[PDB]
Amino acid sequence: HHHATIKQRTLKNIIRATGVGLHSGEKVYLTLKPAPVDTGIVFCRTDLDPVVEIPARAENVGETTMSTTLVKGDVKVDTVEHLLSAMAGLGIDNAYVELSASEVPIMDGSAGPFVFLIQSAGLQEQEAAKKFIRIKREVSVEEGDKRAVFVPFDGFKVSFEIDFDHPVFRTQQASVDFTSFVKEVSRARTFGFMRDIEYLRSQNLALGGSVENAIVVDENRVLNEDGLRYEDEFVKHKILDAIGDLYLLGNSLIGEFRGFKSGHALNNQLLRTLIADKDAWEVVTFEDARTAPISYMRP
Ligand SMILES: CC(C)([C@H](NC(=O)c1ccc(C#CC#CCCO)cc1)C(=O)NO)S(C)(=O)=O
Numbered sequence: 001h002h003h004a005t006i007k008q009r010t011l012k013n014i015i016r017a018t019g020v021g022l023h024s025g026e027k028v029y030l031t032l033k034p035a036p037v038d039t040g041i042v043f044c045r046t047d048l049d050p051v052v053e054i055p056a057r058a059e060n061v062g063e064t065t066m067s068t069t070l071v072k073g074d075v076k077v078d079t080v081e082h083l084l085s086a087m088a089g090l091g092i093d094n095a096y097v098e099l100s101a102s103e104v105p106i107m108d109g110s111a112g113p114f115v116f117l118i119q120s121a122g123l124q125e126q127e128a129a130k131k132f133i134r135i136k137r138e139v140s141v142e143e144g145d146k147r148a149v150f151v152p153f154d155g156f157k158v159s160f161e162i163d164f165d166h167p168v169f170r171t172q173q174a175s176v177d178f179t180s181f182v183k184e185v186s187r188a189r190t191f192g193f194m195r196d197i198e199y200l201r202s203q204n205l206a207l208g209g210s211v212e213n214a215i216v217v218d219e220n221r222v223l224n225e226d227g228l229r230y231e232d233e234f235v236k237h238k239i240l241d242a243i244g245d246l247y248l249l250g251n252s253l254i255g256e257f258r259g260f261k262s263g264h265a266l267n268n269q270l271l272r273t274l275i276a277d278k279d280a281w282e283v284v285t286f287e288d289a290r291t292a293p294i295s296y297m298r299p
């Protein structure tokens, strides 16, 4: 009976998965491996000689059209946000993500398969304190009517509001206080509208997309035969995307995020503004899990 530091976590065992890239349609082999303390999440292109390694950090984000992409020179890793959301939701600090192709596999469009594979392998607590980024001041970015904000909050909470001119919503808004990740949002799938598909595919985007890995919406209806997993699956997926984009900070957050029609580009603009404003955040640890504002599942 004593105080217990909240510790960094990595994988207990290797995870292997095969899939297809949502936007490239390429077949890709994925391997998640444990990593030492303070490594962070690092993506490794193992189809290249030499292997190119890209830390999953805000400073390495290149394009943010359709998905969050990591770049180093001529080498990219596309669509990292759903896997990163699973890592953040489960509290994984350190891991190598090996990919045989430029895009993370889409799986079923959600973080569900990733959390299942990770939790089946199990997590391993490590002998070093977990570092948190605590929001100390309000930080806001806007572009037009889009908005993304960090607010101080003793915990971790994400709110999101979207406005789509579309019958399938019959405004969607949701707030989640991390209730917890596996239950609340992990299973929420990405979505696409048929009105955009021919244009997107002409741009070598959405080439792997299908009803097997996305909610496909036409003029009026969801086309997936078995429908939605949640009444508010769309905005729940926006929250999933935000959690993964925010994990590009490299540490879990103590604070609140509020998104208003935000997406990957504005999310990354928010992280860059936050990092530059060192008055607005500090790195903290917790030597006694009992007085911390966050708690994590058993490993
Ligand atoms: C929701 C987004 C934030 C983004 N999703 C996409 O990009 C996406 C997803 C699915 C399809 C499809 C299909 C099909 C079909 C049927 C056969 O042609 C196309 C695009 C995302 O989840 N990023 O993390 S989006 C678009 O609002 O930016």
Ligand SMILES: [Mg+2]
Pocket: 081, 082, 190, 237, 241
């Ligand atoms: Mg998404």
